[PDB]
Structure formats: C-alpha cells, structure tokens
Write a protein that binds this ligand. Structure first.
Ligand SMILES: CC(C)(COP(=O)(O)OP(=O)(O)OC[C@H]1O[C@@H](n2cnc3c(N)ncnc32)[C@H](O)[C@@H]1OP(=O)(O)O)[C@@H](O)C(=O)NCCC(=O)NCCS
Ligand SMILES: CC(C)(COP(=O)(O)OP(=O)(O)OC[C@H]1O[C@@H](n2cnc3c(N)ncnc32)[C@H](O)[C@@H]1OP(=O)(O)O)[C@@H](O)C(=O)NCCC(=O)NCCS
Ligand SMILES: CC(=O)OP(=O)(O)OC[C@H]1O[C@@H](n2cnc3c(N)ncnc32)[C@H](O)[C@@H]1O
Ligand SMILES: CC(=O)OP(=O)(O)OC[C@H]1O[C@@H](n2cnc3c(N)ncnc32)[C@H](O)[C@@H]1O
Lengths: 562, 562
C-alpha cells in the first residue's frame, strides 16, 4: 500500500490509539517501499498541502518582542520553495552542507523543509554555541552554506574566519547577508533515496570530542512515527514542544511529530531564561492541546501557584530527555487531572520506549518499548535478560534493522564501540518490570546530562587544558535536583600555580568564553592526583563513588563550588 | 668541549665503535654550543680543508658516459666558494629559496656546500619530477633561484615559464644559463644560527598533496651523526650511497655522513634503470670500502651469480628506507662474509634506530634506537609499552627535543596531528624484542613506499580524476617482493567508457604525463563502487583485506596489471 495511504491510516489510528491498531500499523510499516523517497514532496505537499493547504500549519510567538505570526500549510510550502530556490541559486547541490543556527522562527521550519526537499545535509546548531565550538564543527564538516538569525550572526562570521561560503540570514544585515526569500520557482524535489542522509547532529560522546550522528530521509522523517505514537499527536491538535533549536527533540516534537499528522504547530521563542509563568500563560492563552516539555521545565512549573491556571483545552502532556520523578507527575495530575507521560530515546534514534496514551502509566517508569524497535536489555557479555528486576545495558537489535535508527556516527571507531555484533548500544542502563515496564537507572557511559543537555567529558577537559595553570582535568556528573546533573571539574595544577578560589574563578571565566553555558563547570576542585587504573586511564567512576561518600557525610576539601 | 674537538673525537670513535664510547659522545653533544653554527665554516673548512686539503674528497663516475672525475677537499671548497659568490652576485640573500635538480655530479656537492655556507634554503628536487609536479612545488614555495643539469633544463624552464628568477646550470646552454663558476671571491660564511633553516624537503602525506619538512643548519648537518654512528664510516673509507638526488637518503649517506668524518665520497651517476651487475662492477673496480643501498637494490643484487665478484676491500655494507628481508642478508653474508645492517629513519629525522657496527645483528630487525633520540613505542591512548612482542606506534619523545628532528612541517594541521602532547608520531608501527631490538610491522598511514620512494594516495587519486573517464579513484599499496609495495589504482568509470586493458593503458599513459614514474600505478582495476563508511570515507583497509584474500585463493577480476 501507497506512501500516502500509510500516513492517512496512521492519522486515523492517532484519533483513537489502541494496542491492536498499533500492531496493525507496525505490520504496515513492514510493507512500505521507501527505496526512493522525499518526505516534503511525498507527505508534506502530497498529503497536507493538498488536503490542508489553507489550514493554519504553524503559530509562532516571540515572548520577548510580542511579535506574532501564523502560517498555513500552503504559505509555508511556498516559503520553503523560495529558500530552496535561493539555495540552488547561490550554487548548492544535493549532499551540500548547511549549518542552521536560528531562534525558533517560521524561517527555521522553512529551512528544515527546503533541506529535506533539496536532499541537502543540514547541521542544526544551537544558539548557545560559542565561536570556539563553531570552529570545531567547521573543522570537522566544512560548510557549503550558513544560515543565522541576526543575533547569532556575529558568532558565525568570526568562526568562519577565512572560509568563503554562502552566508544567509533570517533578518537584515550589513554584508554578505542575503535573505533566503527570492524565487518560488525552481522548487523541484530532489529525488532522494530513503537511505540518503539529510541531517548531521553533532552529539556528545563519552570518550572524546563530539562527533556527528547521521540521519537519512527515512530515519527521522518516518521513524518519528514512534515518537508521535507515544505522545498522541492528532490532526486537530495544537502541539507545543519546549526544545532548543539545534537538537533532536526539536526535530522530534516541534517539527516531525506534528507535521506527520497535519496538526497545528505552536512555536514559542524566548531569549535567555524561561519565564516559567509567562510561558504557561502563553500555553493557556493559545489553547495548546498537546504539550511536550523536558523534565527540567516540569520541575520549574510545579513551584508556581498553579491555581492561577485553568488549562481548559489541554489534552496531551508528555516529557523526555531526562528522568521524571513521580512526585512531579502527582502534583500536575492533582492540580489538572492530567498525567505527564515519560518517553525515552536518543539523538541517535527516535522514540524507543514510553507511556503511550492507552497505557496505564507507571510513575518513574518510562513505560514499554515501541514494537518497531527491537529493544533488548543485555547483561555483560550480551545475554539478554529475563529476570525482571535485574539491571543491564539498553540495546537495539539490528537483525531486522529498525527504522528510526541513525545510519551511524561520523567516527568509525565509535561505530565499532557502539555497534556490537547484531546490537547497537545506547550505553544507558535500566531494568524490566514484571509487566515489561522499564525504569531508567542511569548511564553506563561517563556522559553527563544537565538540563536536557548531553555533555561529554572530553569537551570540557580539553577546554580546561587551555588555561595556562592546568596540567590535568577530569569532568564528572554531580547529582542536582533541578537540572538532573551538574558539571564538576577536578583539576591538577602545574608547579608554581597555587590552588585558590581566586584561581578557580579565573579558569571558570575563561571556560565561559569557550564552552556553551550548560557546560561551564558549576564546581571546581583542585586536587593532587586523579585516580587511575594501571593502564593510565582516569577512573571517573571512582570519582563519583568518592562524591557519593562525600555527600553522605557532607565533605568538601579545596573544592570551590562555582 | 669545542666544536672542532668534538668532531675529531667522533672520528676516533668511528675507527673503533663501541657502546661505551657512544654513550660518552652522547654526553659531549649535550655540552656543545651550537647557537650560532655554520657547518661548512666550522667543520668542512676548519677541520677537513685545513688538515685534509689535498686529500681526495670525491670520486665521481658516470657509468653511461664513462666520464670520470676526482676532487680534493680544497678543490671542492674553492668550487663551493665560486658558486656562492656567483649566487650572491646575481642577487641572493640568506633565507632565499633554491631549487636543486641535478644528476649525481660533483657540482651537486658544490652547490650543497654553497647553500649551507650562504644560509640559503634549498629544495632538493629529484630529476624524475614532471613539469606538472614542479608547478605544484613552485605554487607552494616560490623560488628565488634554480639550478639544473643540461637535460632537465627543459622541464624546469616550462614550469618556471611563470616568472623570471635567477637561473643556473651545471653545463652550457643558450638562455638564462649562468654558470656558477664565475668567481671564487665573496666566499664569506654567512653567520647562520643553529636554528636557521637551510633544507626544505617536499614529503608525501597520506591524506593529501605533499607538504614540506623543515631542516636547520644543525638538524641535518649534525643530527647526521646518528646516521654516521650507525653506518660505521671512517676517514680512511671510500663511501658510496645508492640514492636519487632530491631525497633525504642522499643528504644522509651521500653528503653529510661521509664528509663529517672526512671520508672519500664516491658518486656514481647512471641514467634510467639500474644495471644491477654493472653497478656492483664499478663498486669493486673503484674499491669502495663502505657502501649503502636501499633494500630494493639489495633484492636485485641477490639474483646475480655472485661468484663473479670478490669484494676485496669492502668493509661496511648497510641498508635503509624499507624492511630488509632476512634472506637477503643471509645470501650476501654467505657469499662475502659481510652483513647488511638495516637502519631506519624518515625525511623528518636522521637515523633513529639501526644495527650499529658493534651490535650483533638480528635478521629483519632494524636494531636498537640511537641514544640521541628518545624513541618510545606507544599503544593507542599513548601508553608506552613494556610487553616486548606488542605492536605499537613509533614516536619520539620531545621532552629534551632531539636534535636532528625537523623543526616541523609546512602545514600546521599535520603538525597538530603528528606532534601529540609530548610526542612526535612517525605513525610507523613496530614491536620490541625482549632485548630491546625493533621490528617494523608497517605504517598506520595509508602511505605507500615503492623502491624507497614514499608515495601518498591523494597525489595520485587527484591525478587520476584528471582523466575524462574517471569518476572515482582509490590508490593502495600492494605487496611486491622487489619494491616493498606496488601502486594499485581502483577506478570507477563514467558511463560510456567500457573497462578494457586498452582503456587502462590509455589512463596509464596520461598519468606518465602528470606523475613521477614511481607514482604511475603498476596496476589498474576497474570496479563498480568502492567500499565506504557512512561518512563517505573510502575503506582502503577493506581494499587490502580484499586483495590479500584474492591472493590467498589465487583470483583477479577485470584488474589489468600495467
Ligand atoms: C529546560 C529548559 C527550558 C530550562 O529552562 P532555563 O532555566 O530557562 O534554561 P537553561 O538553564 O538551559 O538556560 C537558561 C539559563 O542559561 C542562560 N543561558 C544559556 N544559554 C544562553 C544564551 N545563549 N544566551 C544567554 N543566556 C543563556 C540564561 O540566561 C539562564 O541563566 P541561568 O542558568 O542563571 O538560569 C532549557 O534548558 C531547555 O530548553 N533545554 C534544552 C532542551 C533541548 O532541546 N536539549 C537537547 C535535547 S535533544
Ligand atoms: C632503489 C633503486 C636504486 C632501484 O633501482 P631501479 O630499479 O633501476 O630504479 P627504478 O625502477 O625506481 O627506476 C628505473 C626505472 O624507472 C624509469 N625511471 C625512473 N625515473 C626516471 C627518470 N628520472 N628518467 C628516466 N627514467 C626514469 C627507468 O627508465 C626505469 O624503467 P624500467 O625499470 O622499466 O627500465 C631506485 O629506486 C632508487 O634510486 N631509489 C631512490 C632511493 C631514494 O632516494 N629514496 C627516496 C626517499 S629517501
Ligand atoms: C532526545 C534526547 O534526549 O537525546 P540526547 O540529548 O542525545 O540525550 C540522549 C540521552 O538522554 C537520556 N534520556 C532520554 N530520554 C530519557 C528518559 N525518558 N528518561 C531518562 N533518560 C532519558 C538517556 O540517557 C539518553 O541516552
Ligand atoms: C630516509 C628515508 O628513507 O626516508 P623517507 O623516504 O621519508 O621515508 C620514511 C619511511 O620509510 C620507511 N622506512 C625507513 N627505514 C626503514 C627500515 N629500516 N625498515 C622499514 N621501513 C623503513 C618507514 O615507513 C618510514 O616512515
């Protein structure tokens, strides 16, 4: 059965989700022939622009400015077509690289479209990212094209240095900043193969510097159905996602999940800190019926006087990126008679397990796996677990290779580490419930996750060695209640340098310069020796055990705490 | 410990080498003040011209022509002085760039002198190099000055069509052909600092087009003692090296090592292919007592009826630039009671490990490292190895940064790759013997070495893409017994072109045009698609695996083999 038939049948299943009907959809995925496939052409245009061309596709609000905008599927399609023209016009061919660094803005959605439509490789780039970070990224994947909002432009320029490349803006600017909107014509689909790459996410890894996860014109564009399945997004729905541009969750709940079902997207852009109340006021005042927010946000929402809210038209509420304490779910349920449904997955994939709408949520459980993923819980030496309450690594079986699973990393050795002989390793660790539920326990990696931002040690460590006074560094995750973890840095000095709170200050402010804010360590401890195995490897694990002991007792040595 | 005292004590140590006396020399080096240092002034003139002025310094023979020559150290100093005058006279200053492309000829050695004496930066250029390649070189580093023999005048001219720069010859031709023999006077040493650059070698890289390694008026001229200690060369010696002009091995064993000890140099010039027998005939017929030859030559020498030679006054025989097969050493030893002592190094360095004369040779082994270099065998994650039979990368420690070690490359990123955190990477891989011997296993690079010529893929791949019929190319080294590896080229055709031994021929002839002989592929295999990672990287690894399996089973499959 045809591409278009598939998606419509899914949409109907969304309007009343049920396990049987899910099993049906699962088989139908098995039948799809995706060998040459362009999502914009085949689904956006062919279904939604056809059948919903005049339906309002996106509603956008800048909290800071007040600026409002609303675009219909048609208006939107022509916008995307203009950009695709303007890209080809400034000399871009399929497979060419496009960095995208913008605020939440209608033109962000236009550019996502252009890129899928034109079969280009886009690199979503956060707006936190520092010139340093951008120069690394370019060094890894050199850019054919650059697109930025006015405020993030100065950073991109400086990072490029000598590189000459196409430079585009969403606003109006002084020099080599041409607007994307020019020609509707020349909006011809690229015939892209399903297995063609269109997106490169720069994801943080344990061992080293962040590399790229590689997503095809089928992996995300259709795999995202797993996500939608768990959230319960329908055609009627107004959908809202609290995610930053430059990351997957954006692609998941802000872009693909709503637009698959022809829903109305709601995009709220703010600079700086989350006005927790003002935000929820917009939610209520725009009548959003489907809402996904990272746990860190939910944590902030609870602390408010919630009596001032009557979330009148709110139907679906979800969470993903970090653990969600039952206590939070309870308070929200108590105040509004809605449950927040925790779901799981990685930049590397789409939604993997979760509390579907028709599933009795178990608090703090993420829930049950999606049947399209072949989810296995392996012990050491890859024996999949039966015993419910026993802990192990979380893995995808590749034998039937799930769609949604990224083609693989940019760094073939991390490919060899992660992919093990019929299994992909997420590295994360969990246990089964008798009833086949899933409770996240933590990360096998040395990976840190603060405020839904995944940070890998080496990024910060190497940043630290940039200071004259630093001979060795070790970056670890510390428990925090608000953001799930915090960044701690153990440091060993050169001769001459003495350990001082004044010095810790100095180093940290240098790091502000180099690292994205979420990455600047909130704690700096000067030490003598770092724990090492014989090999010479740093036992960061051992540092965290040390920190568990310290926190049971209330210890602090010469740690500086900011 | 004065400069001159040092070298005379070194010469004595050469007359009977021993580990004790070596360790002593090592300390004495530590004491030298070479902060301003000119090799010709301080060593050539001061020691040899003074005390060996009338000693025959060089004997030169052209096999083909029959032309014979003999020059004393004085005659030679006068020669160098003439040219240096003539260079200054035509407007050359210290730090000026001088390309040198000649056949083995006394004036080659005169010009080497002039250059070091005048503090000029020379680019030794083999006489193979194509007009194409020379245009590359000039593009990278502009020439002040050019010196060529009669025959390759043509080629330089065409590459130098570009500009007017000072142009000089070893013979007598019509246009911009100034002899360097004009004036002895103005032969005044340039006050060169130890760390001043005098030699720039264009060396082939794995990833890309060749860059330049940078050598000072101390690195080679005195680091060359590593080399000379290893090949036990003496004052009394008649020394011969089989190397092509325009590469390191020449500077090492043909120029610096002999002239350090005030030996008698022997230069044999031949055009085209090595008359394996006729060459050795000249060796015996001249009474060479110390001889160095690349392994590829030794391999050719074995195949002879060796009974027809009685190598009467031959004392030292040595090898370098490739592995030396035990079989070869054995056959030569059996026939002549001489061992061929395999030593090692890079254009980047001087001799680093070798079979010193006082060392019991282990077949296949390079031998033991030279004490001037801190040689380390690091595993992945740079943990120096203890376990003897364990393969790792070969690295120099920079802690005290050994002299002889090139300042660095012309390209800062290859500098960042190679020089890693207290260590320079040769990239080469080897293992220890219990007793601290060293057995080269291969290159970590995708680098090829044929007949002691170090060839880099990208040069040749790009050269191939120049052909109309070539869509994709991939260059790999295949085993050969005579040359250590051979150049194989995997090609993906454009549509229309049909694979044929005749098409392979056509491409080969075009490559003769663009690339130096050692770089023309000896094999062309037309294939459909090449194996690649997700990234788009060509898995050369995978190519060689394929070829070793094909050769174990004895198969081919539309490869054309010249
Ligand atoms: C969950 C979330 C809303 C938390 O609310 P928040 O407190 O406003 O968010 P953050 O702490 O991350 O960032 C705001 C804070 O950092 C500062 N900040 C961060 N980046 C900044 C930037 N580029 N410019 C200015 N300030 C910045 C803000 O001023 C504020 O300061 P504070 O730390 O003293 O509060 C927010 O972190 C978020 O959206 N997370 C990212 C979700 C995501 O897509 N991650 C990847 C998953 S695939
Ligand atoms: C090792 C060596 C002596 C082997 O001798 P050889 O086998 O006669 O040499 P080669 O095969 O490389 O070159 C001779 C062949 O190439 C051709 N050739 C190579 N360069 C040539 C040139 N500049 N002009 C003419 N012919 C040339 C010859 O005609 C001959 O072809 P043939 O074998 O079909 O008759 C030779 O490779 C050599 O001198 N190598 C240099 C070592 C060196 O300096 N290393 C560089 C890095 S340190
Ligand atoms: C979309 C996204 O988050 O991708 P990314 O930023 O790459 O993070 C990936 C890591 O997030 C953690 N994670 C995600 N969902 C979670 C959940 N429901 N409960 C607990 N942990 C969760 C895991 O540890 C993953 O490995
Ligand atoms: C002087 C010269 O030849 O330098 P150069 O042309 O730059 O090449 C350097 C490369 O030659 C190889 N090499 C040199 N000596 C060797 C030996 N004894 N055994 C095995 N391999 C050897 C290595 O692989 C080097 O990395």
């Amino acid at each position: 059965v045809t591409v278009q038939d598939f998606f419509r049948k899914f949409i109907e299943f969304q309007n009343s989700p049920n396990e049987k009907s899910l099993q049906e959809i699962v088989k139908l995925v098995g039948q799809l022939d995706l060998r040459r496939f362009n999502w914009v052409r085949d689904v956006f245009e062919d279904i939604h622009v056809k059948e919903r061309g005049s339906k309002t596709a996106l509603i956008w609000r800048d909290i800071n400015t007040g600026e409002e905008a609303k675009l219909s599927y048609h208006e939107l399609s022509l916008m995307s077509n203009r950009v695709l023209s303007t890209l080809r016009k400034h000399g871009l061919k399929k497979g060419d690289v496009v960095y995208l660094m913008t605020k939440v803005h209608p033109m962000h959605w236009a550019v996502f479209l252009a890129v899928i439509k034109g079969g280009f490789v886009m690199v979503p780039s956060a707006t936190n990212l520092t010139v340093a970070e951008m120069k690394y990224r370019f060094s890894d994947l050199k850019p054919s094209a650059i697109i930025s909002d006015s405020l993030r432009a100065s950073v991109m320029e400086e990072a490029l240095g000598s590189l000459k490349v196409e430079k585009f803006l969403i606003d109006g600017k002084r020099e080599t900043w041409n607007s994307l909107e020019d020609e509707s014509s020349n909006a011809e689909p690229e015939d892209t193969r399903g297995e063609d790459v269109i997106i490169n996410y720069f994801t943080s890894g344990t061992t080293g510097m962040p590399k790229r996860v590689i997503h095809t014109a089928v992996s995300y564009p259709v795999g995202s159905i797993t996500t939608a399945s768990i959230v319960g997004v329908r055609e009627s729905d107004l959908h809202l996602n609290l995610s930053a541009t430059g990351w997957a969750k954006f692609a998941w709940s802000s872009f693909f999940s709503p637009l698959l079902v022809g829903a109305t997207v709601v995009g709220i852009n703010y600079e700086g800190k989350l006005d927790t109340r003002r935000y929820l006021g917009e939610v209520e005042n725009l009548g959003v019926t489907s809402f996904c927010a990272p746990p860190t946000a939910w944590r902030q929402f609870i602390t408010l006087d919630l009596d001032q809210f009557r979330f009148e038209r709110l139907r679906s509420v979800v969470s993903a990126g970090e653990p969600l304490n039952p206590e939070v779910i309870k308070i929200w349920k108590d105040k509004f008679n809605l449950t927040i449904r925790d779901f799981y997955g990685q930049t590397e994939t789409t939604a993997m397990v979760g509390n579907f709408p028709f599933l009795k949520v178990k608090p703090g459980s993420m829930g049950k796996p999606h049947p399209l993923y072949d989810i296995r819980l392996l012990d050491d030496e890859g024996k999949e677990i039966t015993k419910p309450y026993e802990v192990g690594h979380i893995t995808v079986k590749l034998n039937p290779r799930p769609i949604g699973l990224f083609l693989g990393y940019s760094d073939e050795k991390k490919n060899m580490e992660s992919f093990r002989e019929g299994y992909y390793y997420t590295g994360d660790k969990a246990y089964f419930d008798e009833e086949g539920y899933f409770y996240f326990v933590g990360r096998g990696d040395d990976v840190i996750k603060t405020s839904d931002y995944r940070v890998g040690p080496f990024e910060v460590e190497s940043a630290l060695l940039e200071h004259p006074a630093v001979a060795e560094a070790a970056v670890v995750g510390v428990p925090d209640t608000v953001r799930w973890q915090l960044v701690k840095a153990y440091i060993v000095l050169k001769k001459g340098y003495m350990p001082s709170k004044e010095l810790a200050e100095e180093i940290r402010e240098k790091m502000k310069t180099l690292l994205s804010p979420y990455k600047v360590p909130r704690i700096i401890e000067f030490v003598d020796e770092l724990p090492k195995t014989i090999s010479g490897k740093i036992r960061r694990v051992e540092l965290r055990k040390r920190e568990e002991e310290k926190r049971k007792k209330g210890e602090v040595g010469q740690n500086e705490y900011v």
